[PDB]
């Protein structure tokens, strides 16, 4: 089962890269949302 | 392969923690989007 | 290793529930974004 | 447990496919947010 075990490890590494993408894009999104909100509110 | 299995388990819980934080931040985005929409809706 | 194998399966089931949440929240977000965009554009 | 291992592998790739589609949709959100911001920025 060491072959399948290796597949699992490779999939997890692939999953991580995807989670990192989601994590960084989320940050950009919320930061943009806050700016948009500010453009529509009294300052 | 008990060493590998164990590693998979650790990594999974680590990535689940990242996905968890991600779901919480998405909730902030949805809430912020609703506030933006209201600022654009005749009240 | 059947014990650790079971932990893996349980973590994956937990991961799925989280991915479903992200998936549905994303839909709500984009739908709201499109509406907001429409409120700011010629119609 | 080769049956379980195999199952884990299948499920992982299935969930990775869902995360994959998720990352693509986030890109649409970021792009849509930039367009909304510009509609609010003196051009
Ligand atoms: Ca989002």
UniProtKB/TrEMBL annotation, chains A, B, C, D:
Name of protein: Non-structural glycoprotein 4
PTM comment: The N-glycosyl content is primarily Man(9)GlcNAc, with a small amount of Man(8)GlcNAc.
Family of this protein: Belongs to the rotavirus NSP4 family.
Subunit structure: Homotetramer. Interacts with the immature particle in the viroplasm. Interacts with host CAV1, early and late in infection. Interacts with host integrin ITGA1/ITGB1 heterodimer. Interacts with host integrin ITGA2/ITGB1 heterodimer. Interaction with microtubules blocks trafficking to the Golgi apparatus.
Domain remark text: Binds 1 calcium ion per tetramer.
Coiled-coil intervals, chain numbering: 1-18
Organism name: Simian rotavirus A/SA11
Biological function: Plays an essential role in the virus replication cycle by acting as a viroporin. Creates a pore in the host endoplasmic reticulum and as a consequence releases Ca(2+) in the cytoplasm of infected cell. In turn, high levels of cytoplasmic calcium trigger membrane trafficking and transport of viral ER-associated proteins to viroplasms, sites of viral genome replication and immature particle assembly. The secreted form acts as an enterotoxin that causes phospholipase C-dependent elevation of the intracellular calcium concentration in host intestinal mucosa cells. Increased concentration of intracellular calcium disrupts the cytoskeleton and the tight junctions, raising the paracellular permeability. Potentiates chloride ion secretion through a calcium ion-dependent signaling pathway, inducing age-dependent diarrhea.
Highest taxon in the source lineage: Viruses
Residues annotated for Ca(2+) binding in this entry: 26, 29
Intracellular or extracellular location(s): Host rough endoplasmic reticulum membrane; Host membrane, Host caveola; Secreted
Lineage of producing organism: Viruses, Riboviria, Orthornavirae, Duplornaviricota, Resentoviricetes
